[PDB]
Design a protein around this motif. Structure first.
Motif, PDB file in Angstrom:
ATOM      1  N   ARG A   1     -84.792 -34.454 -26.463  1.00  0.00           N
ATOM      2  CA  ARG A   1     -84.442 -33.399 -25.520  1.00  0.00           C
ATOM      3  C   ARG A   1     -82.958 -33.393 -25.174  1.00  0.00           C
ATOM      4  O   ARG A   1     -82.452 -32.372 -24.694  1.00  0.00           O
ATOM      5  N   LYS A   2     -82.254 -34.502 -25.400  1.00  0.00           N
ATOM      6  CA  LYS A   2     -80.805 -34.504 -25.242  1.00  0.00           C
ATOM      7  C   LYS A   2     -80.116 -33.813 -26.408  1.00  0.00           C
ATOM      8  O   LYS A   2     -79.066 -33.188 -26.222  1.00  0.00           O
ATOM      9  N   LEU A   3     -80.692 -33.912 -27.608  1.00  0.00           N
ATOM     10  CA  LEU A   3     -80.157 -33.214 -28.770  1.00  0.00           C
ATOM     11  C   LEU A   3     -80.486 -31.725 -28.736  1.00  0.00           C
ATOM     12  O   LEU A   3     -79.814 -30.932 -29.406  1.00  0.00           O
ATOM     13  N   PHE A   4     -81.485 -31.332 -27.944  1.00  0.00           N
ATOM     14  CA  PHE A   4     -81.876 -29.929 -27.853  1.00  0.00           C
ATOM     15  C   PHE A   4     -80.817 -29.101 -27.134  1.00  0.00           C
ATOM     16  O   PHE A   4     -80.409 -28.038 -27.617  1.00  0.00           O
ATOM     17  N   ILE A   5     -80.359 -29.571 -25.969  1.00  0.00           N
ATOM     18  CA  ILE A   5     -79.324 -28.867 -25.221  1.00  0.00           C
ATOM     19  C   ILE A   5     -77.923 -29.283 -25.634  1.00  0.00           C
ATOM     20  O   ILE A   5     -76.946 -28.839 -25.016  1.00  0.00           O
ATOM     21  N   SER A   6     -77.790 -30.121 -26.664  1.00  0.00           N
ATOM     22  CA  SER A   6     -76.471 -30.473 -27.175  1.00  0.00           C
ATOM     23  C   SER A   6     -75.877 -29.372 -28.041  1.00  0.00           C
ATOM     24  O   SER A   6     -74.709 -29.468 -28.431  1.00  0.00           O
ATOM     25  N   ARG A   7     -76.655 -28.342 -28.360  1.00  0.00           N
ATOM     26  CA  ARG A   7     -76.187 -27.194 -29.121  1.00  0.00           C
ATOM     27  C   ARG A   7     -76.335 -25.881 -28.370  1.00  0.00           C
ATOM     28  O   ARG A   7     -75.448 -25.030 -28.451  1.00  0.00           O
ATOM     29  N   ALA A   8     -77.421 -25.716 -27.604  1.00  0.00           N
ATOM     30  CA  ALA A   8     -77.702 -24.452 -26.932  1.00  0.00           C
ATOM     31  C   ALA A   8     -76.728 -24.146 -25.803  1.00  0.00           C
ATOM     32  O   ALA A   8     -76.630 -22.987 -25.387  1.00  0.00           O
ATOM     33  N   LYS A   9     -76.007 -25.144 -25.297  1.00  0.00           N
ATOM     34  CA  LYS A   9     -74.957 -24.887 -24.324  1.00  0.00           C
ATOM     35  C   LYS A   9     -73.566 -24.897 -24.930  1.00  0.00           C
ATOM     36  O   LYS A   9     -72.642 -24.356 -24.315  1.00  0.00           O
ATOM     37  N   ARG A  10     -73.392 -25.492 -26.112  1.00  0.00           N
ATOM     38  CA  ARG A  10     -72.137 -25.314 -26.832  1.00  0.00           C
ATOM     39  C   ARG A  10     -71.991 -23.889 -27.334  1.00  0.00           C
ATOM     40  O   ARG A  10     -70.870 -23.405 -27.508  1.00  0.00           O
ATOM     41  N   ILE A  11     -73.106 -23.202 -27.575  1.00  0.00           N
ATOM     42  CA  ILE A  11     -73.045 -21.804 -27.972  1.00  0.00           C
ATOM     43  C   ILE A  11     -73.035 -20.882 -26.756  1.00  0.00           C
ATOM     44  O   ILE A  11     -72.559 -19.742 -26.853  1.00  0.00           O
ATOM     45  N   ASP A  12     -73.493 -21.358 -25.599  1.00  0.00           N
ATOM     46  CA  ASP A  12     -73.587 -20.495 -24.430  1.00  0.00           C
ATOM     47  C   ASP A  12     -72.233 -20.335 -23.755  1.00  0.00           C
ATOM     48  O   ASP A  12     -71.778 -19.214 -23.511  1.00  0.00           O
ATOM     49  N   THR A  13     -71.564 -21.450 -23.462  1.00  0.00           N
ATOM     50  CA  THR A  13     -70.321 -21.386 -22.705  1.00  0.00           C
ATOM     51  C   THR A  13     -69.146 -20.886 -23.532  1.00  0.00           C
ATOM     52  O   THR A  13     -68.093 -20.588 -22.960  1.00  0.00           O
ATOM     53  N   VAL A  14     -69.293 -20.793 -24.852  1.00  0.00           N
ATOM     54  CA  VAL A  14     -68.244 -20.186 -25.659  1.00  0.00           C
ATOM     55  C   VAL A  14     -68.384 -18.669 -25.661  1.00  0.00           C
ATOM     56  O   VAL A  14     -67.403 -17.947 -25.459  1.00  0.00           O
ATOM     57  N   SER A  15     -69.606 -18.159 -25.833  1.00  0.00           N
ATOM     58  CA  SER A  15     -69.797 -16.717 -25.921  1.00  0.00           C
ATOM     59  C   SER A  15     -69.644 -16.017 -24.577  1.00  0.00           C
ATOM     60  O   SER A  15     -69.457 -14.797 -24.551  1.00  0.00           O
ATOM     61  N   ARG A  16     -69.701 -16.754 -23.464  1.00  0.00           N
ATOM     62  CA  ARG A  16     -69.252 -16.198 -22.193  1.00  0.00           C
ATOM     63  C   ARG A  16     -67.754 -15.953 -22.188  1.00  0.00           C
ATOM     64  O   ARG A  16     -67.275 -15.153 -21.381  1.00  0.00           O
ATOM     65  N   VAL A  17     -67.008 -16.634 -23.051  1.00  0.00           N
ATOM     66  CA  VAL A  17     -65.566 -16.500 -23.125  1.00  0.00           C
ATOM     67  C   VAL A  17     -65.136 -15.806 -24.412  1.00  0.00           C
ATOM     68  O   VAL A  17     -64.214 -14.988 -24.399  1.00  0.00           O
ATOM     69  N   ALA A  18     -65.815 -16.093 -25.524  1.00  0.00           N
ATOM     70  CA  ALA A  18     -65.386 -15.552 -26.808  1.00  0.00           C
ATOM     71  C   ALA A  18     -65.684 -14.067 -26.949  1.00  0.00           C
ATOM     72  O   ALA A  18     -64.899 -13.355 -27.579  1.00  0.00           O
ATOM     73  N   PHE A  19     -66.793 -13.585 -26.386  1.00  0.00           N
ATOM     74  CA  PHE A  19     -67.073 -12.152 -26.432  1.00  0.00           C
ATOM     75  C   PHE A  19     -66.053 -11.290 -25.684  1.00  0.00           C
ATOM     76  O   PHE A  19     -65.632 -10.274 -26.262  1.00  0.00           O
ATOM     77  N   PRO A  20     -65.594 -11.605 -24.460  1.00  0.00           N
ATOM     78  CA  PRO A  20     -64.502 -10.798 -23.902  1.00  0.00           C
ATOM     79  C   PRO A  20     -63.170 -11.037 -24.565  1.00  0.00           C
ATOM     80  O   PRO A  20     -62.306 -10.157 -24.494  1.00  0.00           O
ATOM     81  N   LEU A  21     -62.962 -12.188 -25.200  1.00  0.00           N
ATOM     82  CA  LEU A  21     -61.662 -12.446 -25.803  1.00  0.00           C
ATOM     83  C   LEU A  21     -61.454 -11.591 -27.042  1.00  0.00           C
ATOM     84  O   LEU A  21     -60.394 -10.982 -27.209  1.00  0.00           O
ATOM     85  N   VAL A  22     -62.464 -11.504 -27.909  1.00  0.00           N
ATOM     86  CA  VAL A  22     -62.312 -10.681 -29.103  1.00  0.00           C
ATOM     87  C   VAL A  22     -62.439  -9.198 -28.791  1.00  0.00           C
ATOM     88  O   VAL A  22     -61.954  -8.368 -29.566  1.00  0.00           O
ATOM     89  N   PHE A  23     -63.060  -8.840 -27.671  1.00  0.00           N
ATOM     90  CA  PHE A  23     -63.172  -7.433 -27.322  1.00  0.00           C
ATOM     91  C   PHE A  23     -61.888  -6.917 -26.698  1.00  0.00           C
ATOM     92  O   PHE A  23     -61.424  -5.827 -27.037  1.00  0.00           O
ATOM     93  N   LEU A  24     -61.300  -7.687 -25.790  1.00  0.00           N
ATOM     94  CA  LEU A  24     -60.072  -7.248 -25.155  1.00  0.00           C
ATOM     95  C   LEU A  24     -58.861  -7.445 -26.047  1.00  0.00           C
ATOM     96  O   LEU A  24     -57.819  -6.835 -25.792  1.00  0.00           O
ATOM     97  N   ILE A  25     -58.968  -8.266 -27.092  1.00  0.00           N
ATOM     98  CA  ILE A  25     -57.896  -8.298 -28.076  1.00  0.00           C
ATOM     99  C   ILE A  25     -58.038  -7.133 -29.042  1.00  0.00           C
ATOM    100  O   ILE A  25     -57.086  -6.798 -29.758  1.00  0.00           O
ATOM    101  N   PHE A  26     -59.201  -6.486 -29.065  1.00  0.00           N
ATOM    102  CA  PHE A  26     -59.359  -5.293 -29.876  1.00  0.00           C
ATOM    103  C   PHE A  26     -58.751  -4.085 -29.185  1.00  0.00           C
ATOM    104  O   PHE A  26     -58.011  -3.319 -29.809  1.00  0.00           O
ATOM    105  N   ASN A  27     -59.027  -3.926 -27.889  1.00  0.00           N
ATOM    106  CA  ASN A  27     -58.499  -2.793 -27.141  1.00  0.00           C
ATOM    107  C   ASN A  27     -56.990  -2.857 -27.007  1.00  0.00           C
ATOM    108  O   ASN A  27     -56.326  -1.818 -26.969  1.00  0.00           O
ATOM    109  N   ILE A  28     -56.425  -4.061 -26.967  1.00  0.00           N
ATOM    110  CA  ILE A  28     -54.974  -4.176 -26.902  1.00  0.00           C
ATOM    111  C   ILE A  28     -54.338  -3.912 -28.256  1.00  0.00           C
ATOM    112  O   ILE A  28     -53.115  -3.760 -28.341  1.00  0.00           O
TER     113      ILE A  28
END
Ligand SMILES: *[C@@H]1O[C@H](CO)[C@@H](O[C@@H]2O[C@H](CO)[C@@H](O[C@@H]3O[C@H](CO)[C@@H](O)[C@H](O)[C@@H]3O)[C@H](O)[C@H]2NC(C)=O)[C@H](O)[C@H]1NC(C)=O
Ligand SMILES: *[C@@H]1O[C@H](CO)[C@@H](O[C@@H]2O[C@H](CO)[C@@H](O[C@@H]3O[C@H](CO)[C@@H](O)[C@H](O)[C@@H]3O)[C@H](O)[C@H]2NC(C)=O)[C@H](O)[C@H]1NC(C)=O
Ligand SMILES: *[C@@H]1O[C@H](CO)[C@@H](O[C@@H]2O[C@H](CO)[C@@H](O[C@@H]3O[C@H](CO)[C@@H](O)[C@H](O)[C@@H]3O)[C@H](O)[C@H]2NC(C)=O)[C@H](O)[C@H]1NC(C)=O
Ligand SMILES: *[C@@H]1O[C@H](CO)[C@@H](O[C@@H]2O[C@H](CO)[C@@H](O[C@@H]3O[C@H](CO)[C@@H](O)[C@H](O)[C@@H]3O)[C@H](O)[C@H]2NC(C)=O)[C@H](O)[C@H]1NC(C)=O
Ligand SMILES: *[C@@H]1O[C@H](CO)[C@@H](O[C@@H]2O[C@H](CO)[C@@H](O[C@@H]3O[C@H](CO)[C@@H](O)[C@H](O)[C@@H]3O)[C@H](O)[C@H]2NC(C)=O)[C@H](O)[C@H]1NC(C)=O
Lengths: 346, 346, 346, 346, 346
Positions: free
Chosen positions: C310-337
């Motif tokens: 169960r430690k290996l289970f959330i060792s990936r599902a939160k590495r993908i979560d906290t990036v896409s909270r940041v990576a999705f606005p970063l690539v979107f607002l770099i598109f509009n600029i």
């Protein structure tokens, strides 16, 4: 010696008493005008408006004895359309015109030539938008008989008679194709002699038989709707229990077969009766809804029906399974053997 | 000294016996009218109606020996279109008119000039809506050959002959572009000499080859339908078990590929045969439905198939998995290597 | 004493040798016709047809020395349009007419006045449907330059020259608005002197720069498609586990962003190249599909990955979560600029 | 004794010096033409084109002292439209014509009668397609003021002045209804006296105020969109736990309120600014999406939050439940009490 | 002996004082023009525009004593339409024209014959596009009464009176069918005598009663919407518990009954009031939403409500089940027994 246009100005001028307002053989037998057309273009057969556009060469032939020259050495005096308002012409019109026009690009597209014995050939180019009532009972497999009819307007039957000539009364251009139809070769030729309180007026008419191109409706409508009925059945070639594979793939057939039924009546007139594409779209919704009705019959058993209780559970769910693997193609192929034969005998 | 319009009124008036109703070289050799056009505008090539609008400068040249002045010191007497009904002109028309008109804004857009030896240049501006039959077998990759043909109406072959001049018989305006097509430079020039029961009449015609702009159909239709087939496969790049991710993402491809197939046949005529956009939309539905057919094959195993029983469970679900990771691109890319080559050799 | 219409009938009648078929300064310098228009109405700028309707007052001014009276005490003899076919007029036309007409309601809307020195003002009212090629590379942010061009038809350059007057060569009516455009004030004025095998003919032209109203496309298309990308991300602001809230709310964004992409190309011509609304609708589908692609990446981990397991289970599902909270606005607002600056520099 | 048409041919013929090309009171005061119209038909008020078709009886009255007979015993000599080109008439036109025509079926629909003192009544029947700019800020609740304006074309202000008569300057036919509008009774009558570089020209105009039929948009658009907001809330009148009844019935409101927003802007011109139907369709999507946003807030608690742990679970799920039973109607009915009052004061 | 056209040129020429600008019986009793029409074609009854196209033979009969020959031996001198501008004719027009035209193909389609006592028959062929206001309260079951009305334009009541003849004032062609309507046999004939400030003018009118073909709307709209209400109830003939079969098959009825309500108002004018197809589409959405409202009432019990607790669980879920098996057909069939009777008595 003297040029013909100079010769003709005294042949039909104020000298020699030619009056263009007076028919030939006046106070005599009626004038026998014989006619034949030449269809250049044909089509845009709209069914919303129930009409069709045609582009013809209307040829008319009669005999004016006042024009029968004798001494000029040729055989056919032509006449440009500038002087064409100077002789008598028949007052033909079309009893189902719905708007029509001449063609005047670079010259009035009109032809006139006069033989020695007063035989007059008169050929003009007309674009017509003729009305024809459309019978759409068996809609993709119908034979439309759209007509055109040529009447006199001012002269009654005892003064002017229309005839079709026996030498090819309707010619058709060589590469004349239609986008949706086939113009059949046999063209009926008959009279439609009118009666009014004014009098009785001559009429001749031609009847064009138009058979559709079924292959478009077979491609867009029948073949996709055929496969959804097959899609309705492979989703019944399914696992043991009830499953969401029996749920979403059943309403899949509902969405498509209504989409095919929505786009079916896209360009159709609002006819009161029922047409042949409807009773195909009806059955291709009925066998769709009989796929969800079997799952509900299974769900009527899967929730209702520990060794005796589990034997009663599959004592119904397989009596309904092995029949509908056979009963669904049996009632479908007994439909096509009755559907298509009615629309291949009419 | 005397102005030309005053000079010309006696050159072709009632004095000197000029009759505008009589062709040059009467009772002689036929009149050789040579022609060339200049396409100002071109387009609105509708396929529902199978026609196209063109805006031309029709130039006609012939020789009237009656007009050959000798003593006036210039070389080219012009003539305004007010007196243009006073000389002989050829009775040209278009055998596939479907309606046409002149242009009369601020002046009749007509030109006439007369050389010393009776050579007559006659240029008018016409808007034509010419019919052309559209062959749509390979629809986005077709080469349409839409023609235009110029005939005499009253004079037969022994009185009037049309020719194309050898000095650029069809010119095209400089920045003439088309919204969907490319007008090729090579324009075929040939005769279409007609025969009727009236006689035989002259014809010349030009053949315009129109090649489409494929890039629009590639943007709207092919590239989205290409990615849904890729969307069909990444949904197969999926977890171990059967899942609703294999359910909703499969019917996702059904809804889109029918939506792309619905909007495909939006502005098309109802041709009977099958066209090239259909057999792309057919396969882009067939490989869509082969994604749901694999999930049902998995569900045929996931419900059918405790250490020996679990070994038999994955003895089939991975034999179907590792093949369709390879078999789906193999049959798809063997289709494109056969689809595109047929439509890049015709 | 004598009324002007009576005075003018002998000024340009058969007496005094005035011939309306002969230009002024015959066998002399070319006639200098100076022109200016007055746009009453403007618009219906269709892009399917690539044309636009305009309603102008065409004013023409030249000098006829034959009309230069001297003894009549006034300064401007007018002339009703009944006698307007009695003087010389320039044979102007429009090189991209595509159909046009006069206006004859209650009177021919024509004006003619003659000064003492033979200066002639001639003003008529025309409705034109002028063709202009539409460049739609950056479609909602384009500046269309639709022109109109005025040529002689019969007279060559050595007989008749068109000019724009320097005193406001194009006036525009006061409250002239456009439904979708802004007519800019600067209007380019230049020559387009044609060459044919007939000769060389004069031309003048005006160039109207049309800038769009971007606000409609911003309301219907951009702002709803902006919020679905925000709808794509709040559905990622979601609970701990995978859930059907991450399922249906992801395909929700698929249905809307294709619906916005379906209704995007509603009234557009079928241009081959790609336009600016496409590469917005492309990215607003790409970031939609990258929301379902993250859930499948989670489902690739939620099915794959008891304290170490169960430690290996959330060792990936939160590495993908906290990036896409940041990576999705970063690539979107770099598109509009990068998107908007290209379409705010051209 | 002598019939009037015989009497009138010498009253305005070549004898007695009547010239139809010369206005009355020449070199005197300007001619006072007084006008009134009679609207037979009205409508087809298109907003895509921003125009409207009207069918009027244009009556014009002036005084020609040259026509003032004295000795004939009657009071009103009429004049058929065959001889109507034989007297002076005002050169009225419409400054926003956009195409118009007369009516010539069975006779030119024109009327002319002449009193003893030279008072001339002149009535014609015109069909007009008049342009009016449409302001669509508050779109279903707007009052459109579409005008029509009548100007002279050749005569300036010092020669010809238009007036409205004070005895009912605009009459309307009795049963004249509109399909979508109400023509108000008060019709503004004012001048629009033009100025050009040619001169200053007279103008009179009438202003028709058109108020819409709001009831159609209330039936198709508002009342269904009102009930979906109620459908948004009864789905919140739901069971204890989170459920798929809170899932599918929430996106149900998404599909309908976008469908109502899709078909909202069906026949509208592409105006840049925002209209009143938009900010209704905006809020009727905002309160739709605030129904799914509450379920996600519940799912933010239902997955996050054994007697103390279950007390903390419902310590939030009912604080959000009993507020949104009250907060959703509070913010909705405070919107309608602000929305409708702004559109019931303008 | 002398031909009639030669005889008639002196009967109505400048000799014998015949003036075509002067009505018969001048300074006497008014001219009694009697009329009857013959409807060749009828239809394209648009409701967006609220008009209809008709193609008639307008016959007019009056008596001109100036034309009453006595000595010529025949009984009916005809007259070609070339000389038709040479006698007096009534200035009939249509008070709701909205555009109309003659027919001039191959000849002006006009007829004129003169009896011995000056009785004049005058028959022309007109295509009319007549406006009629459409009342659409009970829309598929309405009886439209579209009229046509014939007025004088120049002559008042004391000079010219229109009448219908008593011998079949409106004849209809034999095979005249309508695509959507039935022209009833009883045609009301009455006066509509107008009053203006000019005077009072004669009018006669005919009233055509048009009853619809209900069968098209019954096929496309009623019968599919009837079965979805039956589809709403067999989904309630369901298993014991709440199930997703009660979920997706309920919103199935939502999607279809709004799709049938979307395509219902496809070609309808934007009438303010409510029509009969609406209150069918309202109830066929209300009984749809009462299917989901029962499942939510079950889900209000299935989550709320161990031998006593399970007895209270089915103490409500079957009190709601066995009523809605009876209450749903009771309120539906009490609607049809009230809906259809109102639309079968009006
Ligand atoms: C136009 O065509 C019609 C029909 O072909 C011609 O009418 C027919 O004319 C012939 C001779 O002119 C008539 O024949 C005679 O009939 C009488 C009575 O039957 C008989 O006693 C004679 O021995 C002779 O056979 C025939 O009756 C008549 N038919 C009709 C229906 O009128 C007409 O003459 C043609 N006109 C021209 C100008 O070609
Ligand atoms: C219009 O063009 C046609 C075709 O170019 C001309 O017809 C041709 O005219 C020439 C001489 O006028 C003919 O040549 C002669 O042929 C006879 C018989 O072959 C031969 O014995 C002579 O020695 C001479 O070669 C030629 O046959 C004739 N061709 C045809 C098809 O008629 C016509 O003259 C031109 N007309 C004008 C007004 O330019
Ligand atoms: C219409 O406008 C054109 C252009 O403005 C006028 O043509 C120009 O006319 C002037 C005098 O009439 C010419 O000037 C002369 O040029 C010669 C040779 O360069 C020079 O030796 C003289 O001293 C004098 O400057 C000028 O060349 C000529 N330009 C062209 C291009 O032709 C024309 O006269 C105007 N016509 C009327 C009726 O106003
Ligand atoms: C058409 O209507 C106009 C406006 O009603 C008439 O113009 C006006 O005519 C009157 C007399 O004809 C002028 O009145 C005189 O004004 C002078 C200077 O103010 C004054 O000294 C005299 O005692 C007398 O009151 C008035 O000024 C004039 N107004 C304008 C603006 O011109 C015109 O006469 C009418 N024409 C016809 C043919 O009815
Ligand atoms: C056109 O039709 C009208 C209506 O049918 C005719 O008007 C009527 O004409 C008759 C005799 O011409 C009038 O009858 C006489 O009436 C007087 C007064 O009532 C009476 O004293 C006489 O003994 C006789 O009955 C009748 O009044 C009159 N009606 C009207 C409404 O004017 C008219 O004569 C017809 N015109 C033609 C040219 O046919």
């Amino acid at each position: 010696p003297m040029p013909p246009s100079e010769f003709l100005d005294k042949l039909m001028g104020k000298v020699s008493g030619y009056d263009a307002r007076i028919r030939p053989n006046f106070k005599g037998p009626p004038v026998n005008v014989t006619c034949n057309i030449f269809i250049n273009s044909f089509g845009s057969i709209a069914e919303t408006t129930m009409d069709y556009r045609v582009n013809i060469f209307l040829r008319q032939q009669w005999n004016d004895p006042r024009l029968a020259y004798s001494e000029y050495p040729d055989d056919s005096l032509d006449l440009d359309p500038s002087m064409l308002d100077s002789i008598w012409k028949p007052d033909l019109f079309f009893a189902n015109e719905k708007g029509a026009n001449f063609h005047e690009v670079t010259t009035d597209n009109k032809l006139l030539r006069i033989s020695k014995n007063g035989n007059v050939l008169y050929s003009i180019r007309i674009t017509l938008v003729l009305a024809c009532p459309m019978d759409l009972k068996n809609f993709p497999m119908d034979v439309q008989t759209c007509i055109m009819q040529l009447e006199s307007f001012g002269y009654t039957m005892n003064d002017l008679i229309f005839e079709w000539d026996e030498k090819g009364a309707v010619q058709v251009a060589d590469g004349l194709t239609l986008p949706q139809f086939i113009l059949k070769e046999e063209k009926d030729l008959r009279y439609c002699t009118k009666h009014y309180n004014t009098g009785k007026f001559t009429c001749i008419e031609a009847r064009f038989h138009l058979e559709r191109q079924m292959g478009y409706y077979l491609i867009q409508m029948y073949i996709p709707s055929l496969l959804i009925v097959i899609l309705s059945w492979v989703s019944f070639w399914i696992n043991m229990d009830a499953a969401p594979a029996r749920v979403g793939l059943g309403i899949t057939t509902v969405l498509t077969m209504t989409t095919q039924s929505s786009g079916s009546r896209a360009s159709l007139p609002k006819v009161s009766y029922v047409k042949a594409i409807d009773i195909w779209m009806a059955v291709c919704l009925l066998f769709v809804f009989s796929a969800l009705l079997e799952y509900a019959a299974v769900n009527f058993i899967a929730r209702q029906h520990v060794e005796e209780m589990r034997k009663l559970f599959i004592s119904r769910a397989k009596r309904i399974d092995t029949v509908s693997r056979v009963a669904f193609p049996l009632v479908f192929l007994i439909f096509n053997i009755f559907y298509w034969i009615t629309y291949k005998i009419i």
